[PDB]
Every structure is written in structure tokens, then in C-alpha cells.
Amino acid sequence: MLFLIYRKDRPGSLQVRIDNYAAHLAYLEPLKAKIQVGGPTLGAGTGTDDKDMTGSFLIMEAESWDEVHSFVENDPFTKAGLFAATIVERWKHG
């Protein structure tokens, strides 16, 4: 099945994202074949640099909500307490 996974950073915590970014990408690397689409949400203006990042969005294949839960819970970003909001939805291409 496919799941949307939307996660928005807490205010004032951009540096937490930056501090944990390499670990986050290392965490995702062996999982890449299950990720269909993925990237940061961005804030004000038109910039697309690290400083513009405000959250994380992914569309991922998983066999169960349990698998999705483990993926989210084991993320360096989650363990770092980066996020103020997390939204998960089952989903399919139109």
C-alpha cells in the first residue's frame, strides 16, 4: 500500500533539522526503494536552500500501518523531537 507521510517542524527548530540532516538521510538510504516521492516543505519566498526547509513529506510503500509507525518512530528527526505535526494517510495514484 502507499502512504502519505507529512511532518512539519516545530517553530525555531531549523537548526535541529540541520544538525540531524545527515543522520536522517543515512536512515533513508537503505529504504529508498520504498520511497516514491520525497522532499522538504519550504517556507516564505522562493528560496530552495537548506535555510528554507520547514518540514518533510514522503510517499512510501508499506505493508501495514505498523511498518509506517516503525519507519516514523525510528527516524533521527523523530528522535530529535523536530516535529510539531505528523499526518499519515493511506493513498493511491488517481
List residues binding its own copies (CB under 8 A): 1, 4, 6, 8, 10-13, 37-46, 48, 54-55, 57, 59, 65-66, 69, 81, 84-94
How many CA atoms, within 13 angstroms, populate the side-chain half-sphere of residue 38? 18
Nearer to its own copies, 34 or 91 (CB): 91
List Cα–Cα distances, 90 to 4, 9, 34, in angstroms.
Answer: 6, 22, 14
Say how far apart CA 84 and CA 23 lie, in whole Å. Answer: 20
3-state SS class at 75: coil
Nearer to its own copies, 30 or 45 (CB): 45
Nearer to its own copies, 30 or 93 (CB): 93
Q: How far is the CB of 72 from its own copies (least distance, A)?
A: 11
Q: How far is the CB of 52 from its own copies (least distance, A)?
A: 8
Say how far apart CA 15 and CA 34 lie, in whole Å. Answer: 28
Amino acid residing at 71? F
Q: How far is the CB of 30 from its own copies (least distance, A)?
A: 16
